[PDB]
Amino acid sequence: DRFARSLPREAEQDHVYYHHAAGQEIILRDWDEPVTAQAGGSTFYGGDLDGISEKLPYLKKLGVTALYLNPVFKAPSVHKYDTEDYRHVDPQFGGDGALLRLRHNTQLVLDGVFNHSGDSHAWFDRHNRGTGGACHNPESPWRDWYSFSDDGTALDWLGYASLPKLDYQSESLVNEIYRGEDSIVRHWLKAPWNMDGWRLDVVHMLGEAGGARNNMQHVAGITEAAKETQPEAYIVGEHFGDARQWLQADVEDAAMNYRGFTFPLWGFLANTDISYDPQQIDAGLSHQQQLRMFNQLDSHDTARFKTLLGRDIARLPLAVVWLFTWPGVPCIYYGDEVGLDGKNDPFCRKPFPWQVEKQDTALFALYQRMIALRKKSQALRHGGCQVLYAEDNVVVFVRVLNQQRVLVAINRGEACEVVLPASPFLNAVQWQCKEGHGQLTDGILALPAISAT
């Protein structure tokens, strides 16, 4: 929603309908206006469809190639965890034909909302948009996607009534989910549109109290599913937890990473938890996925970096770099490089602006070249990984394999501490130039310069 405003027709007016009245009457807010819309409603700002085609000159020219993106179908809400209509792209976006060009224009990424379901979904449909009414009737093609008790509240999405929990098994649902021809992912895995990938949303619960086989053959089944249509098929599966049902190669080929980067190193850079619970810190998953696992900044389950930042401009262009030498397949948190804020959900969620993105704003021509370097350089892509200097107000380490090099020196401190990052155990010629401005391997330790922090 925070991304870009393509259409004023798919932009619904305020009071245009409601959701779960109240389901109070819609409230909008101008760009550069506050994050959660005024009493008697919210919300509803950026992210429409036609503009990214002409924002890949911002995204993709020359930076990004494919876009990690949230769930993409019907829910009235700004977020849409609760799917209503499945196959067609959600109206607010638009549809899938000014879209259909767009993944081939994009020639992209996506995310699945399928875990939770709609209450006001187009089949079971309390508030009765669908024609079906399982909320009333036990005789419909869409009823036993839940089992029994079919009343006020029970076990669903950590107990949410609006997001019901489905009766997921074989051969039953996921016929319009992943597996089948009807399935939308597989209803979108082909020409002309064919799907680079897709994403799972806290399915760690899936299936009948989650973390049983149910959770994962549901998944293992999808692996061959991956491997059915496209070898490019690339997958994730949301669990906050350490990855394992996250991958086995058998289980996955990728997954999401709080634990990866986003929860570990802020203590170091944004000083603390993603939750924003302070951290003091001075100085598992198979080869392929390592340079394959997803890697980004903040989210709509947690706080944002500036809140963490020592209110310090320095802190983030620093931190951002850490995401470059980094492995996995990063899918950065927009405003990742620009310096923006995002209070606490749904404040965290915050409009994508224009103005501070200037490159006088030293962001630009940092995060710009810094990706670009990791696209000049595969040493920050498929390399081996060493870790180097243990210093308060320093950190060093490398990526090591058999064709190139990059080590990476950093200075923590408000003021420098001269470091000397040696690359003899490196075992590559000394006195030699290492592109930058600029260094000799001489002394088998790097003597160059970069500002306090």
Curated annotation (Swiss-Prot):
<comment type="function">
    <text>May play a role in regulating the intracellular level of maltotriose. Cleaves glucose from the reducing end of maltotriose and longer maltodextrins with a chain length of up to 7 glucose units.</text>
</comment>
<dbReference type="GO" id="GO:0005737">
    <property type="term" value="C:cytoplasm"/>
</dbReference>
<comment type="subunit">
    <text>Monomer.</text>
</comment>
<dbReference type="GO" id="GO:0030980">
    <property type="term" value="P:alpha-glucan catabolic process"/>
</dbReference>
<dbReference type="GO" id="GO:0042803">
    <property type="term" value="F:protein homodimerization activity"/>
</dbReference>
<dbReference type="GO" id="GO:0000023">
    <property type="term" value="P:maltose metabolic process"/>
</dbReference>
<comment type="similarity">
    <text>Belongs to the glycosyl hydrolase 13 family.</text>
</comment>
<feature type="active site" description="Proton donor">
    <location>
        <position position="238"/>
    </location>
</feature>
<keyword id="KW-0326">Glycosidase</keyword>
<feature type="active site" description="Nucleophile">
    <location>
        <position position="201"/>
    </location>
</feature>
<keyword id="KW-0378">Hydrolase</keyword>
<feature type="site" description="Transition state stabilizer">
    <location>
        <position position="301"/>
    </location>
</feature>
<keyword id="KW-0963">Cytoplasm</keyword>
<protein>
    <recommendedName>
        <fullName>Maltodextrin glucosidase</fullName>
        <ecNumber>3.2.1.20</ecNumber>
    </recommendedName>
</protein>
<dbReference type="GO" id="GO:0004558">
    <property type="term" value="F:alpha-1,4-glucosidase activity"/>
</dbReference>
<keyword id="KW-0462">Maltose metabolism</keyword>
